[PDB]
Design a protein around this ligand. Structure first.
Ligand SMILES: Nc1ncnc2c1ncn2[C@@H]1O[C@H](COP(=O)(O)OP(=O)(O)OP(=O)(O)O)[C@@H](O)[C@H]1O
Ligand SMILES: [Zn+2]
Ligand SMILES: [Zn+2]
Length: 516
């Protein structure tokens, strides 16, 4: 670089897009508005003589039917038009077979990076560990890292001959590889690891904070993160704001001289970190999260951002094709799946069993529960479409699971069994049997076996219930909890599709649970 020259560099970032290429029902987010905003920032920076780098923390896949049904093609093509420079591979990039991820790499004009994903049989990285960018005469390296919980959580599929090594350790190796070969002026890490207050990752794999602390001080200008899906705006040292409000100041985290940022999820914000580089020193001069048409129970927090027409023309066919696909038969059933309010809030039903079977299958759970009030429609005997599934599960809840001890299972089920019939809180159970008497659960069994307080059990449910919905005991603040990011409707639809034709007699309750 030129000695004593001051380079202005703006790093824009997003993460955990999860199929949100289109604006939502209230006109929020979407890539068309994102495109207008990013184009505008590039124009602003170009006029000031600076440079722009746009990075993604990953998890482009999974979360919106129109995207999922098309393997996120609209999302990657839209990202090409917004002009992303690089993205870290997220755990949801492995929700589809490797053939699909390789197709996404072909669609994407920017590198999908990860230094710590290895082919087991050869010990060789599967993807590129970093990408180099020339901005002015500076060399900026962006390394990519992926959480090593990827193949560990839920019910793994698609990791043939693949392993995820510890990302913090890999970062150490990569930074050294880079300094010894490329000597980049600036190194930024795009990661899909998660931000945990004060590095308190609990049962989850260590994330960004612990990594920043393990690396040499200031060895990275910043970590552009994701996975945990939070706007990283600090309220106090080592404490993220709770209920961060769009349009308000956002102080990113700084750990061991390394800035750590995250822009929540779904294209809700484009983070903007403005830096000044001079003689080796990377100094952050400003940071903000720029909302993309976010609205407060329907009014804009910041100036409306128009939707770029080129993006609308590019994405519309995908939106239309995805919507039309919702009508297509995904399966069939030989009997009515009972989801009516006056049944699901009074007794166990086959729709409850089917939904819970789908959730257990996705998460590797041993048993499951959900509120009957969460079942919103029945499905008549005959053909089933995704549209039908979305009426049964319309709230967009996320499937989650908790690993708990047998004693915790006893306490949890005992508490949930207190929710009375004729209320939305009445529980639908799967793989649970007992006779409730005087507030106690007698002969409690999981999968036909008495509960062993010394054993570990995995329970699936929805985030709504796990966070205390309907007065259920909270599980989200306990170790062993995992929010999978899979939407209830997608889990049910995919399970019906691979299980069809469904013989509903398999889901008929036979008095496993009773109250008296
Ligand atoms: N966003 C949501 N996610 C999951 N479940 C939900 C959600 N919103 C509502 N429910 C479920 O619906 C129940 C409330 O039902 P509903 O909205 O039909 O009630 P209501 O018409 O106000 O009447 P009541 O108050 O008698 O239930 C809750 O107890 C809960 O189980
Ligand atoms: Zn995610
Ligand atoms: Zn993730």
């Amino acid at each position: 670089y030129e000695q004593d020259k001051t380079y202005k560099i703006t790093v824009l970032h997003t993460n955990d897009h999860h199929g949100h290429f289109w604006r939502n029902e209230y006109g929020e987010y979407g890539l068309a508005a994102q495109k207008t905003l990013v184009d505008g920032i590039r124009k602003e920076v170009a006029a000031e003589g600076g440079s722009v780098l746009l990075l993604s923390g990953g998890d482009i896949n999974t979360g919106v039917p129109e995207s999922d049904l098309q393997d996120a093609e609209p999302d990657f093509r839209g990202m090409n038009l917004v002009g992303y420079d690089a993205m870290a591979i997220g755990n949801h990039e492995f929700d589809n077979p490797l053939t699909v991820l390789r197709q996404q790499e072909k669609w994407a004009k920017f590198p999908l990076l990860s230094a710590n994903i290895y082919q087991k049989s050869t010990g060789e990285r599967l993807f590129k560990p970093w990408a180099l960018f020339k901005r002015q005469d500076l060399k900026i390296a962006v390394i990519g890292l992926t959480t090593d919980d990827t193949a560990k959580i839920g019910n793994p599929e698609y990791f043939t001959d693949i392993e995820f090594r510890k990302p913090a350790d890999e970062a150490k190796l990569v930074i050294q590889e880079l300094q010894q070969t490329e000597k980049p002026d600036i190194i930024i890490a795009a990661t899909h690891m998660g931000h945990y207050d004060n590095g308190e990752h609990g049962s989850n794999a260590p994330g960004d904070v612990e990594m920043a602390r393990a690396l040499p001080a200031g060895s990275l200008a910043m970590i552009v993160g994701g996975h945990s899906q939070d706007p990283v705006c600090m309220a106090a040292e080592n404490k993220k704001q709770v209920d961060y409000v769009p349009g308000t100041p956002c102080k990113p985290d700084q750990q061991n001289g390394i800035w750590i940022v995250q822009a929540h999820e779904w294209g809700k914000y484009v983070g903007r970190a403005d830096f000044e580089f001079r003689n080796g020193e990377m100094k952050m001069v400003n940071y903000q999260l720029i909302p993309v048409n976010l609205k407060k129970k329907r009014v804009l927090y910041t100036p409306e951002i128009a939707e770029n027409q080129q993006m609308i023309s590019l994405l519309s066919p995908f939106q239309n094709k995805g919507k039309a696909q919702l009508e297509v038969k995904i399966g069939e059933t030989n009997g009515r799946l009972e989801g009516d309010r006056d049944k699901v809030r009074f007794v166990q039903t086959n729709m409850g069993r089917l939904i819970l079977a789908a959730q257990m299958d996705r998460t590797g759970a041993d048993f499951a529960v959900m509120s009957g009030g969460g079942i919103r429609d029945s499905i008549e005997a005959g053909d089933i479409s995704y549209k039908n599934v979305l009426k049964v599960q319309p709230f967009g809840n996320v499937v989650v699971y908790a690993d708990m001890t047998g004693k915790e299972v006893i306490d949890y089920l005992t508490a949930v069994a207190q929710m009375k019939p004729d209320s939305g809180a009445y529980p639908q159970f799967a793989n649970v049997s007992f006779v409730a008497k005087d507030g106690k659960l007698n002969d409690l069994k999981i999968k036909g076996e008495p509960v062993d307080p010394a054993k570990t059990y995995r329970m699936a449910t929805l985030n709504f219930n796990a966070t205390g919905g309907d007065g259920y005991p909270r599980l989200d603040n306990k170790p062993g909890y995992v929010n999978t990011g899979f939407i209830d409707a997608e889990v049910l639809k995919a399970y019906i599709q691979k299980s069809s034709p469904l013989d509903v007699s398999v889901y008929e309750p036979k008095g496993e649970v009773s109250w008296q």
